From Swiss-Prot:
Protein name per UniProt: Ubiquitin
From-to range in the entire protein, with total length: 1 to 76 of 229
Functional description taken from the UniProt entry: Exists either covalently attached to another protein, or free (unanchored). When covalently bound, it is conjugated to target proteins via an isopeptide bond either as a monomer (monoubiquitin), a polymer linked via different Lys residues of the ubiquitin (polyubiquitin chains) or a linear polymer linked via the initiator Met of the ubiquitin (linear polyubiquitin chains).
Effect of mutating K63R: Abolishes HLTF-mediated polyubiquitination of PCNA
Residues bearing the modification ADP-ribosylglycine: G76
Residues annotated as site: Essential for function: H68
Organism, as annotated: Homo sapiens
Length: 76
């Protein structure tokens, strides 16, 4: 299925995912397409900060859902 990832600059990227994908898997796809490492990515959906180990289905992320990507430097 297809989901969208929107950045704070307005840029929108389309990803192919499945409900069993983890949030880390989604970050890995963003790394594939954009070169940004998962540990610099914060993903947000439904007003929740998405946890790397949980799945898209855990967050009720569906076809054509839009996630928000916020870049951040790691703690430390």
């Amino acid at each position: 299925m297809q989901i969208f990832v929107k950045t704070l600059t307005g840029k929108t990227i389309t990803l192919e995912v499945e409900p069993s994908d983890t949030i880390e898997n989604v970050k890995a796809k963003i790394q594939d397409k954009e070169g940004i490492p998962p540990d610099q990515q914060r993903l947000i959906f439904a007003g929740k900060q998405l946890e790397d180990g949980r799945t898209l289905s855990d967050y009720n992320i569906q076809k054509e859902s839009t996630l928000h990507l916020v870049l951040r430097l790691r703690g430390g």
